[model samples]
Target: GEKGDWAQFGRYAEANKTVKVPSNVVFMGNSITDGWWPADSTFFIRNNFVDRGISGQTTSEMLVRFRQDVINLKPKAVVILAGINDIAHNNGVIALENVFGNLVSMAELAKANHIKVIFCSVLPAYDFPWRPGMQPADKVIQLNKWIKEYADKNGLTYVDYHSAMKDERNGLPANLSKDGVHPTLEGYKIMEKIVLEAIHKTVK
Candidate 1:
C-alpha cells in the first residue's frame, strides 16, 4: 500500500476483494487522480466509480496494474487520464510514442473485456515545480492531439480537460491550479463536470 508494486494497487486490492461491489467506471491515472478522493469522494462514491490512481506513477506502471485494477473490477467503463508523469519523466525519460503505446494497450485491453473506454486529455501544465524548467506545456498539447485522434478513430469518448482548464500559455491557470500541476478543488469541480458528461456520452 505504501510502497512498491509500482501501480500501488496493493493498497486497495484486498479491500476490493472484500467489498466486491460492481462498479460503473474506474478512474485511472497518477497523482492528480490519486489525490481526487482525498479532496472529496462524494461524487465517485455516489456514481459507482472506483479510483485506481497512484501518485508519481507512469503510464507503464499503470499498464502493469490495468489487469489487476481495471479488468478484474469488471466495470461497465474505464476512464483513463495519464501520460503527464511520463512527460515528467517520473519513471525516467520516455518518448511520447511510448507513452501513447501504453495508453493504447490499456484501451485495447478494456475493449476486449467489453468495457467502455474514455480517454481524458492530460490536464494543462506549463512546468513542474518538483522538476522545474521542462517547459511541459507544448508536450502536453502534442500528446493530447494524439489522444483525441485515437479516440476518434476508435469511437471512444475523449474527455477534454485541457480546453476548459488551460490559460493563455497553455498552462493550468492559477484560478484552477495552485501548484500549476495538480488541480485545485475548484479545478476538480470543473473536471468532474467535464468527465461526467463524457461518461454519459460514452455509454449513450
Candidate 2:
C-alpha cells in the first residue's frame, strides 16, 4: 500500500503544533469552514477562533482527524458545519444515518474532552454545481433537522444558518452564494452573527 495521509493531517500539523492551547473556539467543517477564514480572517483573528476546515473533505475524513484538529487544541467550544459533502457523495454513496452518526461521534468526543459543541445547520444547496441533478435540497433539510433535534436534546447550542440564508427553493440565494454550495462575503457576514451568538452563548 502506498503511504499517504488519507485524512490530510499534514494540512494543519505544523500550525497545530505552534498554536496556543485553550483557544476560544475552533470551527470544523469542509470547504465552508475552510473558506470562512480566507473570506473574513478578522472573524477568526479577532475572536481567536481556529479554523480547521479542509477543502473537499467529508465527515469521514474529519472524524479521523477530530482529535488532532479539535480536541487536542483544547478550545472552549467547537463549531461543526459538515454533512453536505457526505450528501454530495464526495467520499462515495454513504447513508444519511451514517453521516449523522459521524457528527454524533465527533460531538461525543468533544464532550469527553470537555470541549463544548456547537452544531451548525448545513447551508442550503438546491444542487451541487460539481454534481448536478442530485437534488440535495431535501437531504440538507433532513440532515439539519436531525442536527437541530440532537443539539436540543443534548442541550447544545445549534446555529440555524439554513433558516436565515435559504432561498424559496431551499437553496442559497444568488446574493449570498456565488455557487450553490459556498458562501460569499455577504453570506459569511450573516453566518458571522449567528455563529458568534452561539459561541458567546456556549463558550461563556
Candidate 3:
C-alpha cells in the first residue's frame, strides 16, 4: 500500500505536466480546499484553479511538497489554507510557532519564485470530531493572527474565511458543516465568493 503520499506528488505531478491551465491560481490546502472541487467543480473547472489539497494533512506535510507542488508548477498566485491539522495535532504535539514557521517558509518560497502569496485563515473549529476534548477554537484564532500579521509584513494577500464561516460557538455551524470541521456545499459557496474577491484584489 502507498503510505502518506508525501513526496511522490502522484496526481499533481502528472497534471502539472499534461495540462495547459487556465488561471495561474493554485489553492494549496488540506481537505477543505480539496473538498471544494466535489462540492462545486465548475467553479474551479471554469476558472482553471488548481487544487493541491490533501486530506488529513498538516503544514509540515505541505512544506515537503511545496517545491514540486507550488514553485515548480509556477503558479501566478498560491492560496494557502493550512494549520487546522496542526492545531488538531495530527502529527502529534507541534508548537504553534513551528506551524507558523512552516507557513512563513512556504510563503517566502512562493515569493522567491515570483508567485503572489495569499494566506488564508485556518477556518474556525471549536472542536475536532476525530480528536475531541481539545479546545482548538481560540488556538485557531491565534494562528490566524499570526498569518495575517505575516502577510501584512510581507505585503502578501490575506483572505479571511474564518470570520464568515464561523458561527456563534466559533465552530462551523451545522448548516455549513455536518462534521463541524469541513464545510458543506453552501459553506463552499460562501468561501468561493470571499476567495475570488481576494484573488481579484491581489492578482489584479
Candidate 4:
C-alpha cells in the first residue's frame, strides 16, 4: 500500500497537479510553512492564498513543483518560506548555490507572469528534532544571507522573520516552536505581521 506520506515528489506532484488557483497572494514553503498562517486569518481568506508547501521536501522537489503548483496559479505575489527541509537532506546534500538556484528560478518564473515576488527569509531555528544530525542553524544564516542579497539585487521583497525570531545566543527565540524548528502559533504571529505588510503592498 502507498504510505500516503509526502516523501515521494512524483506521486505527490501527480496527485495535486490540478488544484484550482486564483490570482491573489500565495505562500509557498514546506511543513513549518504548511500551517504558518491560519486560513481564517483576515489576510488568508480575504485574499487567495496558494499554499504549495509539502512536508519533507527539498529545493529539488520544490523546483519540480514550482511551475505546477505556483506559476500555473498565477498569483499576484508569492511569499516563499522554504529551506529547513533542504538542510535535512530530503533531496541529498545540495550546495548553497543549487538551493539559491531553485529560488531564482521561481522568482524568474513569477516575474515572467508579472507576479510580484517576496523571498521570505527562512524562520530562525536551532535544529530539527524529528531528523537528527542536521544541525542547520549555520546553514540557515548562510542561505538567508543569499536570499536577501538576491532579493535586493532583483528588486524583490525580502521578508525578515528570522531577524525578528532569532535569539541573541541560541539561534531561535524561545517559545517559538515545540520541535525547535516549525513554529507554534506564537511564532506564526510574528511572521503574520511581516507577511501582512507585504500583502498590503501587493494590493496597493
Output the lDDT of residue 117, model 3: 93
Output candidate 4 Cα RMSD: 3.4
Best by lDDT: 2
Backbone clashes for every candidate come to: 0, 0, 0, 0
lDDT of 4 by residue, 1-204 (tens): 445544444644663455455567767788866665552355455555665666677777677777766777777788888887777777678887788888888788889888898888887767777778777788899999999999989888888888888886436655887777777788887887888887787555
Which regions of candidate 2 fall more than 4 Å away from where they truly are? 1-3
Off by over 4 Å in 4: 1-22, 37-43
lDDT tens digits, residues 1-204, model 3? Answer: 447565447758777776554348888888898888889879887887878888888999899889877887788899999999999998779999999999999988888888999999998898998999989999999999999998998898898999998888788888999789999899999988999999998886
Q: Is 1 or 2 the stronger prediction by TM-score?
A: 2
The TM-score of predicted model 3 comes to: 0.94
Error of 3 at 28 (Å): 0.3
Better of 2 and 4 by lDDT: 2
**Total backbone clashes of candidate 4, pairs 3 or more residues apart or in separate chains:** 0
Q: List the candidates' TM-scores in order.
A: 0.95, 0.97, 0.94, 0.85
Cα RMSDs, all models:
2.2, 1.2, 2.0, 3.4
* Residue 158 shift from truth in candidate 2, angstroms: 0.5
lDDT of 1 by residue, 40-101 (tens): 77868887788888898889989988988888888889999999999999888899999999
Off by more than 4 A, model 3: 1-4, 21-23
